[PDB]
Protein backbone atom coordinates (compact mmCIF):
# COMPACT_ATOMS: atom_id res chain seq x y z
CA UNK A 1 0.00 0.00 0.00
CA UNK A 2 1.43 3.38 -1.07
CA UNK A 3 1.28 6.63 0.96
CA UNK A 4 2.19 9.93 -0.73
CA UNK A 5 3.14 13.08 1.19
CA UNK A 6 4.47 16.42 -0.10
CA UNK A 7 8.14 16.80 0.71
CA UNK A 8 7.88 20.17 2.42
CA UNK A 9 5.53 22.89 3.66
CA UNK A 10 6.32 26.48 4.74
CA UNK A 11 3.98 28.21 7.20
CA UNK A 12 4.11 31.49 9.11
CA UNK A 13 3.48 31.49 12.87
CA UNK A 14 -0.18 31.96 13.61
CA UNK A 15 -1.27 30.56 10.24
CA UNK A 16 -2.65 27.11 9.40
CA UNK A 17 -0.37 24.26 8.37
CA UNK A 18 -1.94 21.58 6.14
CA UNK A 19 -0.10 18.28 5.61
CA UNK A 20 -1.69 15.76 3.26
CA UNK A 21 -1.29 11.99 2.92
CA UNK A 22 -2.65 10.45 -0.29
CA UNK A 23 -3.61 6.84 -0.84
CA UNK A 24 -6.02 4.75 -2.85
CA UNK A 25 -9.30 4.84 -0.92
CA UNK A 26 -7.33 5.94 2.15
CA UNK A 27 -10.63 7.20 3.61
CA UNK A 28 -11.52 3.53 4.16
CA UNK A 29 -8.47 3.22 6.44
CA UNK A 30 -7.47 4.70 9.77
CA UNK A 31 -4.54 7.12 9.52
CA UNK A 32 -2.06 7.85 12.31
CA UNK A 33 0.30 10.84 12.35
CA UNK A 34 3.74 11.33 13.87
CA UNK A 35 5.93 14.36 14.59
CA UNK A 36 9.72 14.00 14.54
CA UNK A 37 12.29 16.66 15.46
CA UNK A 38 16.03 16.35 14.72
CA UNK A 39 17.84 13.73 16.77
CA UNK A 40 14.61 12.55 18.42
CA UNK A 41 12.23 9.65 18.14
CA UNK A 42 8.81 10.31 16.60
CA UNK A 43 5.86 11.42 18.74
CA UNK A 44 2.27 10.31 18.00
CA UNK A 45 0.16 13.45 17.46
CA UNK A 46 -3.08 12.13 15.87
CA UNK A 47 -4.42 8.58 15.96
CA UNK A 48 -7.36 7.00 14.14
CA UNK A 49 -7.72 9.90 11.69
CA UNK A 50 -8.80 12.56 14.16
CA UNK A 51 -8.17 11.57 17.79
CA UNK A 52 -5.63 13.53 19.86
CA UNK A 53 -3.63 11.48 22.38
CA UNK A 54 -3.57 12.89 25.87
CA UNK A 55 -1.05 15.72 26.07
CA UNK A 56 -1.22 16.75 22.40
CA UNK A 57 -2.27 20.43 22.07
CA UNK A 58 -5.72 21.11 20.72
CA UNK A 59 -4.33 23.01 17.70
CA UNK A 60 -3.51 19.61 16.12
CA UNK A 61 -6.42 18.04 14.27
CA UNK A 62 -6.95 15.44 11.57
CA UNK A 63 -9.48 14.26 9.04
CA UNK A 64 -9.65 11.59 6.33
CA UNK A 65 -11.91 11.25 3.29
CA UNK A 66 -11.72 9.83 -0.22
CA UNK A 67 -8.08 9.60 -1.31
CA UNK A 68 -6.61 12.17 1.11
CA UNK A 69 -5.95 12.25 4.83
CA UNK A 70 -5.03 15.63 6.31
CA UNK A 71 -3.13 16.74 9.41
CA UNK A 72 -3.95 20.36 10.28
CA UNK A 73 -1.99 22.47 12.71
CA UNK A 74 -4.09 25.55 13.37
CA UNK A 75 -2.43 28.69 14.72
CA UNK A 76 0.93 27.04 14.23
CA UNK A 77 3.75 27.81 16.70
CA UNK A 78 7.52 27.87 16.27
CA UNK A 79 7.88 24.61 18.24
CA UNK A 80 5.67 22.78 15.76
CA UNK A 81 8.48 22.82 13.17
CA UNK A 82 9.24 19.17 12.51
CA UNK A 83 8.94 16.34 10.03
CA UNK A 84 5.46 14.82 9.96
CA UNK A 85 4.68 11.25 8.84
CA UNK A 86 1.40 9.54 8.14
CA UNK A 87 0.95 5.81 8.68
CA UNK A 88 -1.65 3.11 8.00
CA UNK A 89 -2.10 -0.59 8.68
CA UNK A 90 -3.14 -2.97 5.93
CA UNK A 91 -4.44 -6.52 6.22
CA UNK A 92 -2.01 -7.52 3.45
CA UNK A 93 -4.18 -10.22 1.84
CA UNK A 94 -3.45 -12.33 4.93
CA UNK A 95 0.01 -10.86 5.77
CA UNK A 96 -0.65 -7.69 7.77
CA UNK A 97 1.69 -4.75 7.66
CA UNK A 98 2.19 -1.09 8.48
CA UNK A 99 3.41 1.52 6.00
CA UNK A 100 4.64 5.10 6.47
CA UNK A 101 4.42 8.04 4.11
CA UNK A 102 7.64 9.65 3.00
CA UNK A 103 7.36 12.53 5.45
CA UNK A 104 6.74 16.27 5.13
CA UNK A 105 9.26 18.80 6.44
CA UNK A 106 7.18 21.58 8.02
CA UNK A 107 9.15 24.82 8.40
CA UNK A 108 7.60 27.43 10.68
CA UNK A 109 9.01 30.66 9.28
CA UNK A 110 11.41 32.31 11.72
CA UNK A 111 13.71 34.31 9.46
CA UNK A 112 13.58 35.90 6.00
CA UNK A 113 13.39 33.82 2.87
CA UNK A 114 16.82 33.41 1.32
CA UNK A 115 17.38 32.12 -2.22
CA UNK A 116 20.25 29.63 -2.54
CA UNK A 117 23.65 30.28 -4.00
CA UNK A 118 24.90 27.27 -5.98
CA UNK A 119 28.58 26.56 -6.65
CA UNK A 120 29.47 23.60 -8.89
CA UNK A 121 33.07 22.39 -8.98
CA UNK A 122 34.21 20.04 -11.74
CA UNK A 123 36.64 17.24 -10.93
CA UNK A 124 40.03 18.64 -10.01
CA UNK A 125 42.95 17.93 -12.30
CA UNK A 126 44.55 16.21 -9.29
CA UNK A 127 41.60 13.86 -8.83
CA UNK A 128 41.40 13.06 -12.55
CA UNK A 129 45.09 12.20 -12.49
CA UNK A 130 44.29 9.79 -9.60
CA UNK A 131 41.82 8.14 -12.03
CA UNK A 132 38.71 9.36 -10.20
CA UNK A 133 36.18 12.13 -10.74
CA UNK A 134 33.74 13.91 -8.41
CA UNK A 135 31.40 16.79 -9.23
CA UNK A 136 30.77 18.84 -6.07
CA UNK A 137 27.61 20.95 -5.86
CA UNK A 138 27.58 23.26 -2.82
CA UNK A 139 24.36 25.05 -1.93
CA UNK A 140 24.55 27.92 0.52
CA UNK A 141 22.76 30.82 2.19
CA UNK A 142 19.18 29.56 1.88
CA UNK A 143 16.02 29.52 3.96
CA UNK A 144 13.73 27.56 4.44
CA UNK A 145 16.18 24.68 4.79
CA UNK A 146 14.56 22.37 2.23
CA UNK A 147 15.89 21.70 -1.28
CA UNK A 148 15.73 19.03 -3.98
CA UNK A 149 18.87 18.37 -6.03
CA UNK A 150 18.77 16.92 -9.54
CA UNK A 151 21.76 16.02 -11.68
CA UNK A 152 21.99 15.93 -15.47
CA UNK A 153 24.52 14.67 -18.00
CA UNK A 154 23.98 16.80 -21.06
CA UNK A 155 20.17 16.89 -20.83
CA UNK A 156 19.62 13.43 -19.37
CA UNK A 157 18.89 12.93 -15.65
CA UNK A 158 21.47 10.96 -13.66
CA UNK A 159 20.53 9.10 -10.46
CA UNK A 160 23.33 6.59 -9.93
CA UNK A 161 26.40 7.88 -8.15
CA UNK A 162 24.67 10.71 -6.27
CA UNK A 163 24.93 11.47 -2.56
CA UNK A 164 23.31 14.52 -0.94
CA UNK A 165 23.43 15.91 2.60
CA UNK A 166 20.51 17.18 4.62
CA UNK A 167 20.61 20.98 4.99
CA UNK A 168 22.13 22.29 8.20
CA UNK A 169 22.83 25.78 9.49
CA UNK A 170 25.85 27.90 8.60
CA UNK A 171 27.61 30.31 10.94
CA UNK A 172 25.27 33.07 9.70
CA UNK A 173 22.14 31.02 10.55
CA UNK A 174 21.13 30.33 6.94
CA UNK A 175 21.15 26.77 5.59
CA UNK A 176 23.62 25.01 3.33
CA UNK A 177 23.62 21.56 1.72
CA UNK A 178 25.94 19.57 -0.54
CA UNK A 179 25.54 17.05 -3.35
CA UNK A 180 28.07 14.87 -5.16
CA UNK A 181 28.06 13.01 -8.47
CA UNK A 182 30.73 10.30 -8.63
CA UNK A 183 31.87 9.47 -12.16
CA UNK A 184 34.71 7.72 -13.89
CA UNK A 185 37.10 9.94 -15.81
CA UNK A 186 35.75 8.35 -18.98
CA UNK A 187 32.15 9.26 -18.08
CA UNK A 188 33.22 12.82 -17.25
CA UNK A 189 34.93 13.42 -20.59
CA UNK A 190 32.34 11.59 -22.72
CA UNK A 191 29.57 14.17 -22.26
CA UNK A 192 29.41 17.80 -23.33
CA UNK A 193 28.35 19.07 -19.89
CA UNK A 194 26.94 18.16 -16.50
CA UNK A 195 24.48 20.18 -14.41
CA UNK A 196 23.38 20.49 -10.79
CA UNK A 197 19.81 21.78 -10.42
CA UNK A 198 18.54 22.96 -7.04
CA UNK A 199 14.83 23.40 -6.36
CA UNK A 200 13.91 25.77 -3.53
CA UNK A 201 10.40 27.01 -2.70
CA UNK A 202 8.91 26.54 -6.16
CA UNK A 203 11.81 27.77 -8.34
CA UNK A 204 15.11 26.32 -9.56
CA UNK A 205 18.72 27.39 -10.05
CA UNK A 206 21.07 25.32 -12.22
CA UNK A 207 24.83 25.47 -12.61
CA UNK A 208 26.68 23.71 -15.45
CA UNK A 209 30.30 22.61 -15.98
CA UNK A 210 32.03 21.04 -18.99
CA UNK A 211 35.08 18.75 -19.25
CA UNK A 212 36.47 20.87 -22.09
CA UNK A 213 36.08 24.21 -20.26
CA UNK A 214 38.04 25.68 -17.34
CA UNK A 215 35.11 26.46 -15.01
Amino acid sequence: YELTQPPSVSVAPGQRATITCGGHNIGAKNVHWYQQKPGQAPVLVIQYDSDRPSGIPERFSGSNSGSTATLTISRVEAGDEADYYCQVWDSGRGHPLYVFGGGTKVTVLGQPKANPTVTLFPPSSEELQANKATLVCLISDFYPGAVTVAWKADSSPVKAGVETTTPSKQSNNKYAASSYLSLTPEQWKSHRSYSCQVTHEGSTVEKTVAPTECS
Binding site: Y34, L44, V99, G102, E127, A130
Partner: protein, 226 residues
Protein backbone atom coordinates in the same frame (compact mmCIF):
# COMPACT_ATOMS: atom_id res chain seq x y z
CA UNK B 1 5.99 7.10 32.66
CA UNK B 2 6.51 4.63 29.89
CA UNK B 3 10.17 4.23 28.85
CA UNK B 4 11.74 2.18 26.07
CA UNK B 5 15.54 1.92 26.30
CA UNK B 6 17.68 0.69 23.42
CA UNK B 7 21.20 -0.71 23.12
CA UNK B 8 23.15 -3.30 21.12
CA UNK B 9 24.11 -1.17 18.10
CA UNK B 10 27.64 -1.21 16.65
CA UNK B 11 29.62 -0.77 13.50
CA UNK B 12 29.20 -3.99 11.53
CA UNK B 13 30.91 -5.59 8.56
CA UNK B 14 28.85 -6.68 5.54
CA UNK B 15 27.59 -10.21 6.06
CA UNK B 16 27.49 -9.82 9.82
CA UNK B 17 24.45 -9.74 12.14
CA UNK B 18 23.30 -7.16 14.66
CA UNK B 19 21.04 -7.62 17.69
CA UNK B 20 19.36 -4.51 19.07
CA UNK B 21 17.60 -4.50 22.46
CA UNK B 22 14.57 -2.56 23.71
CA UNK B 23 14.05 -2.61 27.50
CA UNK B 24 10.60 -1.53 28.61
CA UNK B 25 9.33 -0.06 31.86
CA UNK B 26 6.34 1.79 33.28
CA UNK B 27 3.55 -0.44 31.93
CA UNK B 28 2.51 -4.09 31.74
CA UNK B 29 5.05 -5.48 29.27
CA UNK B 30 3.02 -8.48 28.10
CA UNK B 31 -0.10 -6.45 27.22
CA UNK B 32 1.45 -4.34 24.41
CA UNK B 33 3.39 -5.54 21.40
CA UNK B 34 6.59 -4.00 20.12
CA UNK B 35 7.17 -2.72 16.58
CA UNK B 36 10.58 -2.04 15.03
CA UNK B 37 11.12 0.86 12.67
CA UNK B 38 14.28 2.06 10.94
CA UNK B 39 15.36 5.33 9.37
CA UNK B 40 18.31 5.71 7.01
CA UNK B 41 20.15 9.04 7.50
CA UNK B 42 18.14 11.88 6.03
CA UNK B 43 15.36 9.48 4.96
CA UNK B 44 11.92 8.41 6.16
CA UNK B 45 10.55 5.92 8.66
CA UNK B 46 10.26 2.28 7.49
CA UNK B 47 8.38 -0.45 9.37
CA UNK B 48 10.37 -3.67 9.93
CA UNK B 49 8.01 -5.88 11.91
CA UNK B 50 6.13 -6.49 15.11
CA UNK B 51 6.15 -9.00 17.96
CA UNK B 52 3.41 -9.92 20.41
CA UNK B 53 5.00 -9.91 23.89
CA UNK B 54 2.25 -12.16 25.32
CA UNK B 55 2.00 -14.96 22.76
CA UNK B 56 5.11 -14.74 20.53
CA UNK B 57 3.37 -13.89 17.25
CA UNK B 58 5.84 -12.24 14.85
CA UNK B 59 4.94 -10.34 11.67
CA UNK B 60 7.79 -9.10 9.45
CA UNK B 61 7.98 -6.71 6.53
CA UNK B 62 8.06 -8.56 3.21
CA UNK B 63 11.24 -6.76 2.17
CA UNK B 64 13.04 -8.31 5.19
CA UNK B 65 11.66 -11.84 4.79
CA UNK B 66 14.17 -14.32 6.04
CA UNK B 67 16.73 -12.03 7.61
CA UNK B 68 15.01 -10.43 10.64
CA UNK B 69 14.05 -12.26 13.83
CA UNK B 70 12.31 -10.67 16.82
CA UNK B 71 12.24 -12.19 20.30
CA UNK B 72 11.33 -11.17 23.84
CA UNK B 73 12.44 -12.02 27.36
CA UNK B 74 9.44 -11.68 29.63
CA UNK B 75 11.54 -12.01 32.77
CA UNK B 76 13.47 -8.81 31.97
CA UNK B 77 10.85 -6.93 29.93
CA UNK B 78 13.21 -6.78 26.93
CA UNK B 79 12.53 -7.12 23.22
CA UNK B 80 15.24 -7.94 20.70
CA UNK B 81 15.61 -7.51 16.96
CA UNK B 82 18.27 -9.47 15.07
CA UNK B 83 19.05 -8.42 11.49
CA UNK B 84 21.29 -10.80 9.47
CA UNK B 85 23.34 -10.56 6.25
CA UNK B 86 23.91 -6.85 6.72
CA UNK B 87 24.87 -4.59 3.81
CA UNK B 88 25.73 -0.92 3.59
CA UNK B 89 22.04 -0.38 2.70
CA UNK B 90 21.21 -1.31 6.31
CA UNK B 91 22.97 1.70 7.81
CA UNK B 92 20.16 3.35 9.76
CA UNK B 93 18.79 4.37 13.12
CA UNK B 94 16.76 1.49 14.55
CA UNK B 95 13.80 2.29 16.79
CA UNK B 96 11.52 0.12 18.87
CA UNK B 97 8.00 1.33 19.59
CA UNK B 98 5.06 0.20 21.70
CA UNK B 99 2.06 -0.94 19.65
CA UNK B 100 -0.81 -2.61 21.48
CA UNK B 101 -1.89 -5.16 18.87
CA UNK B 102 -1.42 -5.79 15.18
CA UNK B 103 -3.37 -8.55 13.52
CA UNK B 104 -5.59 -9.43 10.59
CA UNK B 105 -8.20 -6.86 11.71
CA UNK B 106 -6.27 -4.30 13.76
CA UNK B 107 -3.15 -2.14 13.73
CA UNK B 108 -2.76 0.12 16.73
CA UNK B 109 -0.54 3.22 16.54
CA UNK B 110 2.99 3.43 17.96
CA UNK B 111 2.38 5.47 21.10
CA UNK B 112 5.80 5.38 22.77
CA UNK B 113 9.22 5.01 21.16
CA UNK B 114 12.74 4.04 22.09
CA UNK B 115 15.45 6.63 21.58
CA UNK B 116 16.90 5.01 18.45
CA UNK B 117 20.37 3.53 17.94
CA UNK B 118 22.61 3.89 14.88
CA UNK B 119 23.90 0.74 13.17
CA UNK B 120 26.63 1.57 10.64
CA UNK B 121 27.49 -1.15 8.11
CA UNK B 122 30.83 -0.77 6.38
CA UNK B 123 33.61 -3.09 5.18
CA UNK B 124 36.22 -0.41 5.82
CA UNK B 125 39.09 -0.43 8.25
CA UNK B 126 40.29 2.92 9.57
CA UNK B 127 41.31 4.97 6.51
CA UNK B 128 42.60 8.53 6.25
CA UNK B 129 41.18 10.84 3.60
CA UNK B 130 42.42 11.84 0.18
CA UNK B 131 42.17 15.63 -0.06
CA UNK B 132 41.68 17.40 -3.37
CA UNK B 133 41.47 21.14 -4.01
CA UNK B 134 38.24 22.82 -5.14
CA UNK B 135 39.86 25.68 -7.02
CA UNK B 136 38.17 29.06 -7.52
CA UNK B 137 36.72 29.77 -10.90
CA UNK B 138 39.12 30.74 -13.64
CA UNK B 139 36.63 33.59 -14.33
CA UNK B 140 37.28 35.42 -11.03
CA UNK B 141 39.76 37.76 -12.69
CA UNK B 142 38.65 40.95 -10.95
CA UNK B 143 36.62 42.01 -7.88
CA UNK B 144 33.67 40.60 -5.96
CA UNK B 145 33.83 37.30 -4.08
CA UNK B 146 34.98 33.78 -4.99
CA UNK B 147 34.24 30.36 -3.49
CA UNK B 148 37.03 27.82 -3.04
CA UNK B 149 37.34 24.70 -0.97
CA UNK B 150 38.66 21.24 -0.25
CA UNK B 151 37.12 17.88 -1.08
CA UNK B 152 37.90 15.33 1.67
CA UNK B 153 37.35 11.92 0.11
CA UNK B 154 36.96 8.35 1.26
CA UNK B 155 37.78 8.23 4.96
CA UNK B 156 36.59 6.01 7.81
CA UNK B 157 35.28 6.35 10.54
CA UNK B 158 33.91 9.80 11.30
CA UNK B 159 34.84 12.56 12.06
CA UNK B 160 36.96 14.97 10.06
CA UNK B 161 37.54 18.60 11.03
CA UNK B 162 38.71 21.35 8.70
CA UNK B 163 40.20 24.76 9.34
CA UNK B 164 41.55 27.36 6.90
CA UNK B 165 44.97 29.01 7.13
CA UNK B 166 45.54 27.42 10.54
CA UNK B 167 42.45 29.07 11.98
CA UNK B 168 43.32 32.58 10.76
CA UNK B 169 40.52 32.35 8.16
CA UNK B 170 37.10 31.85 9.75
CA UNK B 171 34.78 34.37 8.10
CA UNK B 172 32.79 32.78 5.29
CA UNK B 173 33.82 29.19 6.09
CA UNK B 174 31.41 26.28 6.06
CA UNK B 175 32.38 22.66 6.55
CA UNK B 176 29.57 20.36 5.47
CA UNK B 177 28.32 17.14 7.04
CA UNK B 178 29.65 13.98 5.46
CA UNK B 179 28.00 11.71 2.94
CA UNK B 180 28.35 7.96 3.37
CA UNK B 181 28.90 6.21 0.07
CA UNK B 182 27.75 2.70 -0.81
CA UNK B 183 31.43 1.73 -0.37
CA UNK B 184 31.03 2.36 3.34
CA UNK B 185 33.42 5.34 3.20
CA UNK B 186 32.66 8.94 4.08
CA UNK B 187 33.42 12.16 2.19
CA UNK B 188 32.83 15.83 2.92
CA UNK B 189 33.75 19.29 1.66
CA UNK B 190 34.73 22.58 3.24
CA UNK B 191 34.24 25.87 1.44
CA UNK B 192 35.24 29.47 2.06
CA UNK B 193 34.15 32.64 0.28
CA UNK B 194 36.92 35.22 -0.14
CA UNK B 195 37.48 38.48 -2.02
CA UNK B 196 38.23 37.62 -5.61
CA UNK B 197 40.94 40.32 -5.65
CA UNK B 198 42.88 38.23 -3.11
CA UNK B 199 43.27 35.18 -5.34
CA UNK B 200 46.69 36.21 -6.67
CA UNK B 201 48.06 37.53 -3.36
CA UNK B 202 46.68 35.46 -0.48
CA UNK B 203 47.54 31.80 -0.02
CA UNK B 204 44.67 29.52 0.96
CA UNK B 205 45.35 26.25 2.78
CA UNK B 206 42.76 23.86 4.17
CA UNK B 207 43.88 22.03 7.30
CA UNK B 208 42.19 18.61 7.39
CA UNK B 209 42.33 16.54 10.57
CA UNK B 210 41.30 12.86 10.76
CA UNK B 211 42.20 11.79 14.28
CA UNK B 212 41.09 8.14 13.94
CA UNK B 213 43.95 7.61 11.46
CA UNK B 214 46.25 10.24 13.05
CA UNK B 215 46.32 12.02 9.68
CA UNK B 216 46.65 15.74 9.09
CA UNK B 217 46.69 17.23 5.59
CA UNK B 218 47.50 20.82 4.61
CA UNK B 219 46.21 21.23 1.04
CA UNK B 220 47.07 24.38 -0.88
CA UNK B 221 44.16 25.62 -3.00
CA UNK B 222 45.31 27.78 -5.91
CA UNK B 223 43.75 29.23 -9.07
CA UNK B 224 43.80 26.83 -12.00
CA UNK B 225 46.36 26.84 -14.81
CA UNK B 226 43.76 25.94 -17.45
Amino acid sequence: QVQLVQSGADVKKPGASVKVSCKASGYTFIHFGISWVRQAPGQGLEWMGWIDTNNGNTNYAQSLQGRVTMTTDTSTGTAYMELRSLSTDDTAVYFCARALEMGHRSGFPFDYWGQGVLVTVSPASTKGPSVFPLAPSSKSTSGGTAALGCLVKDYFPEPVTVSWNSGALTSGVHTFPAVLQSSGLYSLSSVVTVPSSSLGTQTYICNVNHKPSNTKVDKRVEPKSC
